[PDB]
Amino acid sequence: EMQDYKQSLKYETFSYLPPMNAERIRAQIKYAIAQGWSPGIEHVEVKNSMNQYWYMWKLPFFGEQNVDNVLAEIEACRSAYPTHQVKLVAYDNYAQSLGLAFVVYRGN
Template structure:
Protein backbone atom coordinates (compact mmCIF):
# COMPACT_ATOMS: atom_id res chain seq x y z
CA UNK A 1 0.00 0.00 0.00
CA UNK A 2 2.87 2.35 0.75
CA UNK A 3 4.29 1.69 -2.73
CA UNK A 4 0.94 2.59 -4.34
CA UNK A 5 0.79 5.86 -2.43
CA UNK A 6 4.38 6.69 -3.38
CA UNK A 7 3.64 6.14 -7.07
CA UNK A 8 0.65 8.48 -6.87
CA UNK A 9 2.70 11.20 -5.23
CA UNK A 10 5.57 10.91 -7.70
CA UNK A 11 3.36 10.98 -10.80
CA UNK A 12 3.57 14.18 -12.84
CA UNK A 13 0.67 16.59 -12.45
CA UNK A 14 -0.83 18.10 -15.58
CA UNK A 15 -1.46 21.83 -15.39
CA UNK A 16 -4.23 23.16 -17.59
CA UNK A 17 -3.82 26.76 -18.65
CA UNK A 18 -6.72 28.82 -19.94
CA UNK A 19 -6.23 30.26 -23.36
CA UNK A 20 -8.67 33.16 -22.82
CA UNK A 21 -7.96 35.93 -20.29
CA UNK A 22 -10.31 36.11 -17.29
CA UNK A 23 -13.13 38.68 -17.53
CA UNK A 24 -15.60 39.94 -14.98
CA UNK A 25 -19.32 39.43 -15.48
CA UNK A 26 -19.85 43.18 -15.78
CA UNK A 27 -17.55 43.27 -18.78
CA UNK A 28 -19.79 40.75 -20.56
CA UNK A 29 -22.97 42.81 -20.07
CA UNK A 30 -23.83 45.35 -22.77
CA UNK A 31 -23.00 48.94 -21.85
CA UNK A 32 -26.04 51.07 -20.87
CA UNK A 33 -26.48 54.57 -19.66
CA UNK A 34 -27.02 54.71 -15.88
CA UNK A 35 -30.53 55.68 -14.82
CA UNK A 36 -31.33 58.21 -12.10
CA UNK A 37 -32.23 55.40 -9.69
CA UNK A 38 -28.83 53.78 -10.21
CA UNK A 39 -27.03 57.05 -9.51
CA UNK A 40 -28.88 57.88 -6.27
CA UNK A 41 -28.85 56.29 -2.85
CA UNK A 42 -32.15 54.73 -1.85
CA UNK A 43 -33.50 52.07 0.43
CA UNK A 44 -35.99 51.07 -2.22
CA UNK A 45 -39.25 49.87 -0.76
CA UNK A 46 -38.24 50.95 2.76
CA UNK A 47 -38.26 54.60 1.74
CA UNK A 48 -41.96 54.86 2.62
CA UNK A 49 -41.23 53.58 6.11
CA UNK A 50 -38.83 56.43 6.87
CA UNK A 51 -41.12 59.42 6.63
CA UNK A 52 -40.43 62.74 8.32
CA UNK A 53 -42.93 63.44 11.07
CA UNK A 54 -44.75 66.74 11.14
CA UNK A 55 -42.90 68.84 13.77
CA UNK A 56 -45.88 71.02 14.70
CA UNK A 57 -49.18 69.92 16.19
CA UNK A 58 -47.96 66.34 16.43
CA UNK A 59 -49.07 65.55 19.94
CA UNK A 60 -48.02 62.45 21.75
CA UNK A 61 -48.28 61.40 25.34
CA UNK A 62 -46.56 58.27 26.56
CA UNK A 63 -46.21 54.77 25.26
CA UNK A 64 -48.98 53.54 22.94
CA UNK A 65 -50.29 57.05 22.21
CA UNK A 66 -49.77 56.51 18.50
CA UNK A 67 -52.44 53.78 18.63
CA UNK A 68 -56.19 54.31 18.54
CA UNK A 69 -57.81 54.46 22.00
CA UNK A 70 -57.36 51.17 23.86
CA UNK A 71 -60.30 48.88 24.65
CA UNK A 72 -60.98 47.64 28.18
CA UNK A 73 -59.51 44.24 27.27
CA UNK A 74 -56.31 45.85 26.00
CA UNK A 75 -56.04 47.99 29.13
CA UNK A 76 -56.62 44.88 31.28
CA UNK A 77 -53.72 43.11 29.53
CA UNK A 78 -51.44 46.08 30.23
CA UNK A 79 -52.53 46.08 33.88
CA UNK A 80 -51.83 42.32 34.07
CA UNK A 81 -48.32 43.04 32.82
CA UNK A 82 -47.86 45.77 35.45
CA UNK A 83 -49.10 43.56 38.27
CA UNK A 84 -47.04 40.54 37.15
CA UNK A 85 -43.91 42.72 37.30
CA UNK A 86 -44.76 43.90 40.80
CA UNK A 87 -45.45 47.47 39.75
CA UNK A 88 -48.05 49.71 41.39
CA UNK A 89 -50.78 51.09 39.08
CA UNK A 90 -51.84 54.70 39.57
CA UNK A 91 -54.30 56.97 37.76
CA UNK A 92 -53.54 60.61 36.96
CA UNK A 93 -55.57 63.25 35.16
CA UNK A 94 -55.00 66.64 33.60
CA UNK A 95 -57.07 69.36 32.03
CA UNK A 96 -56.84 69.45 28.26
CA UNK A 97 -54.91 72.74 28.19
CA UNK A 98 -52.33 71.46 30.68
CA UNK A 99 -51.78 67.98 29.27
CA UNK A 100 -49.30 68.90 26.54
CA UNK A 101 -45.96 70.64 26.71
CA UNK A 102 -46.38 74.35 26.00
CA UNK A 103 -44.68 77.60 26.94
CA UNK A 104 -47.29 78.54 29.52
CA UNK A 105 -47.54 75.26 31.44
CA UNK A 106 -43.92 74.18 31.91
CA UNK A 107 -40.76 75.70 33.22
CA UNK A 108 -37.84 74.29 31.30
CA UNK A 109 -34.81 75.95 32.90
CA UNK A 110 -33.74 77.46 36.19
CA UNK A 111 -33.85 76.46 39.82
CA UNK A 112 -37.65 76.17 39.83
CA UNK A 113 -37.72 73.30 37.31
CA UNK A 114 -38.81 70.06 38.93
CA UNK A 115 -36.64 67.73 36.89
CA UNK A 116 -39.66 65.44 36.47
CA UNK A 117 -39.71 64.45 32.80
CA UNK A 118 -40.89 67.58 30.98
CA UNK A 119 -41.94 69.44 34.15
CA UNK A 120 -45.67 68.81 33.74
CA UNK A 121 -47.51 67.55 36.73
CA UNK A 122 -50.70 65.57 36.39
CA UNK A 123 -53.00 65.36 39.39
CA UNK A 124 -53.20 61.94 41.01
CA UNK A 125 -56.67 60.38 41.14
CA UNK A 126 -56.95 58.95 44.66
CA UNK A 127 -53.90 57.05 45.92
CA UNK A 128 -51.72 54.58 44.02
CA UNK A 129 -53.31 51.14 44.00
CA UNK A 130 -50.93 49.36 46.36
CA UNK A 131 -51.69 45.66 46.64
CA UNK A 132 -53.84 45.61 43.52
CA UNK A 133 -54.02 42.07 42.12
CA UNK A 134 -56.95 42.29 39.72
CA UNK A 135 -57.20 44.33 36.50
CA UNK A 136 -60.93 44.69 37.20
CA UNK A 137 -60.13 46.92 40.18
CA UNK A 138 -58.13 49.25 37.95
CA UNK A 139 -60.85 49.30 35.26
CA UNK A 140 -63.40 50.25 37.94
CA UNK A 141 -61.19 53.14 39.06
CA UNK A 142 -60.75 54.26 35.44
CA UNK A 143 -64.54 54.35 35.07
CA UNK A 144 -64.82 56.36 38.30
CA UNK A 145 -62.19 58.83 37.11
CA UNK A 146 -64.01 59.24 33.77
CA UNK A 147 -67.26 60.03 35.63
CA UNK A 148 -65.56 62.57 37.89
CA UNK A 149 -63.48 64.24 35.17
CA UNK A 150 -65.11 63.65 31.77
CA UNK A 151 -63.32 66.62 30.16
CA UNK A 152 -59.83 65.60 31.29
CA UNK A 153 -57.12 63.36 29.93
CA UNK A 154 -56.63 60.33 32.16
CA UNK A 155 -53.53 58.19 32.10
CA UNK A 156 -52.51 55.02 33.85
CA UNK A 157 -48.95 54.93 35.12
CA UNK A 158 -46.99 52.22 36.89
CA UNK A 159 -44.40 52.78 39.57
CA UNK A 160 -41.61 50.40 40.51
CA UNK A 161 -41.12 50.64 44.26
CA UNK A 162 -37.66 49.03 44.02
CA UNK A 163 -36.13 51.56 41.63
CA UNK A 164 -38.55 54.28 42.79
CA UNK A 165 -39.32 55.32 39.23
CA UNK A 166 -42.24 55.50 36.86
CA UNK A 167 -41.80 52.55 34.51
CA UNK A 168 -44.92 52.68 32.33
CA UNK A 169 -47.60 55.15 31.36
CA UNK A 170 -50.30 55.47 28.73
CA UNK A 171 -53.59 57.22 28.11
CA UNK A 172 -56.78 55.44 29.07
CA UNK A 173 -59.22 58.30 28.40
CA UNK A 174 -59.35 61.32 26.12
CA UNK A 175 -62.00 64.02 26.52
CA UNK A 176 -64.94 63.79 24.13
CA UNK A 177 -63.92 67.18 22.73
CA UNK A 178 -60.36 66.00 21.96
CA UNK A 179 -59.52 65.83 18.30
CA UNK A 180 -55.78 65.38 18.72
CA UNK A 181 -55.49 61.72 17.78
CA UNK A 182 -54.26 61.18 14.24
CA UNK A 183 -53.18 57.98 12.58
CA UNK A 184 -49.42 57.63 12.06
CA UNK A 185 -49.93 57.85 8.29
CA UNK A 186 -51.49 61.30 8.81
CA UNK A 187 -48.64 62.52 11.03
CA UNK A 188 -45.90 62.37 8.43
CA UNK A 189 -45.09 64.72 5.59
Protein backbone atom coordinates in the same frame (compact mmCIF):
# COMPACT_ATOMS: atom_id res chain seq x y z
CA GLU B 1 -48.35 57.58 -4.71
CA MET B 2 -46.73 59.13 -1.65
CA GLN B 3 -49.03 60.16 1.22
CA ASP B 4 -48.43 63.12 3.51
CA TYR B 5 -47.97 62.87 7.27
CA LYS B 6 -50.93 64.48 9.06
CA GLN B 7 -49.58 66.25 12.14
CA SER B 8 -51.45 65.99 15.44
CA LEU B 9 -50.79 66.18 19.16
CA LYS B 10 -49.45 63.01 20.77
CA TYR B 11 -49.49 61.65 24.31
CA GLU B 12 -46.29 59.64 24.86
CA THR B 13 -46.29 55.85 25.05
CA PHE B 14 -49.03 54.00 23.09
CA SER B 15 -50.41 57.29 21.69
CA TYR B 16 -49.24 56.30 18.19
CA LEU B 17 -51.46 53.18 18.32
CA PRO B 18 -55.26 53.07 18.10
CA PRO B 19 -56.93 53.92 21.42
CA MET B 20 -57.07 50.98 23.80
CA ASN B 21 -60.26 49.10 24.63
CA ALA B 22 -61.14 47.31 27.86
CA GLU B 23 -59.25 44.16 26.83
CA ARG B 24 -55.99 45.97 26.06
CA ILE B 25 -56.31 48.10 29.20
CA ARG B 26 -56.82 44.95 31.27
CA ALA B 27 -53.78 43.34 29.64
CA GLN B 28 -51.63 46.37 30.49
CA ILE B 29 -52.86 46.38 34.10
CA LYS B 30 -52.16 42.65 34.34
CA TYR B 31 -48.62 43.29 33.09
CA ALA B 32 -48.19 46.05 35.68
CA ILE B 33 -49.32 43.81 38.55
CA ALA B 34 -47.21 40.93 37.20
CA GLN B 35 -44.08 43.10 37.31
CA GLY B 36 -44.79 43.95 40.96
CA TRP B 37 -45.60 47.60 40.21
CA SER B 38 -48.34 49.61 41.90
CA PRO B 39 -50.99 50.92 39.47
CA GLY B 40 -51.92 54.58 39.67
CA ILE B 41 -54.44 56.91 38.06
CA GLU B 42 -53.90 60.57 37.13
CA HIS B 43 -55.91 63.24 35.33
CA VAL B 44 -55.34 66.81 34.13
CA GLU B 45 -56.75 69.36 31.70
CA VAL B 46 -55.96 68.82 28.02
CA LYS B 47 -54.13 72.15 27.83
CA ASN B 48 -52.13 71.13 30.94
CA SER B 49 -51.43 67.57 29.75
CA MET B 50 -47.71 68.44 29.57
CA ASN B 51 -47.67 69.10 33.33
CA GLN B 52 -45.13 67.08 35.30
CA TYR B 53 -47.66 66.68 38.15
CA TRP B 54 -51.19 65.52 37.34
CA TYR B 55 -54.13 65.34 39.71
CA MET B 56 -53.93 61.99 41.49
CA TRP B 57 -57.02 59.79 41.51
CA LYS B 58 -57.31 58.71 45.16
CA LEU B 59 -54.06 56.86 46.08
CA PRO B 60 -51.86 54.34 44.26
CA PHE B 61 -53.25 50.80 44.50
CA PHE B 62 -50.54 49.14 46.57
CA GLY B 63 -50.74 45.36 46.57
CA GLU B 64 -53.81 45.50 44.33
CA GLN B 65 -54.26 42.35 42.24
CA ASN B 66 -57.69 42.80 40.62
CA VAL B 67 -57.53 44.37 37.17
CA ASP B 68 -61.32 44.69 37.30
CA ASN B 69 -61.11 47.13 40.22
CA VAL B 70 -58.25 48.98 38.51
CA LEU B 71 -60.37 49.44 35.37
CA ALA B 72 -63.42 50.36 37.45
CA GLU B 73 -61.38 53.10 39.12
CA ILE B 74 -60.26 54.29 35.67
CA GLU B 75 -63.90 54.51 34.58
CA ALA B 76 -64.87 56.25 37.83
CA CYS B 77 -62.15 58.85 37.23
CA ARG B 78 -63.48 59.35 33.70
CA SER B 79 -67.04 59.74 34.99
CA ALA B 80 -66.08 62.23 37.71
CA TYR B 81 -63.86 64.23 35.31
CA PRO B 82 -65.26 63.89 31.78
CA THR B 83 -63.28 66.67 30.05
CA HIS B 84 -59.93 65.68 31.58
CA GLN B 85 -57.19 63.53 30.12
CA VAL B 86 -56.73 60.34 32.15
CA LYS B 87 -53.43 58.46 32.54
CA LEU B 88 -52.57 55.03 33.93
CA VAL B 89 -49.20 54.62 35.66
CA ALA B 90 -47.31 51.86 37.46
CA TYR B 91 -44.93 52.76 40.28
CA ASP B 92 -41.60 50.89 40.48
CA ASN B 93 -40.39 51.42 44.04
CA TYR B 94 -37.04 49.65 43.57
CA ALA B 95 -36.06 51.86 40.62
CA GLN B 96 -37.94 54.93 41.95
CA SER B 97 -39.44 55.31 38.48
CA LEU B 98 -42.52 54.35 36.47
CA GLY B 99 -42.47 50.99 34.71
CA LEU B 100 -45.50 51.91 32.60
CA ALA B 101 -47.25 55.17 31.78
CA PHE B 102 -49.83 55.90 29.09
CA VAL B 103 -53.09 57.81 28.69
CA VAL B 104 -56.40 55.95 28.53
CA TYR B 105 -58.64 58.81 27.37
CA ARG B 106 -57.08 61.60 25.33
CA GLY B 107 -59.48 64.30 26.50
CA ASN B 108 -62.02 66.61 24.90
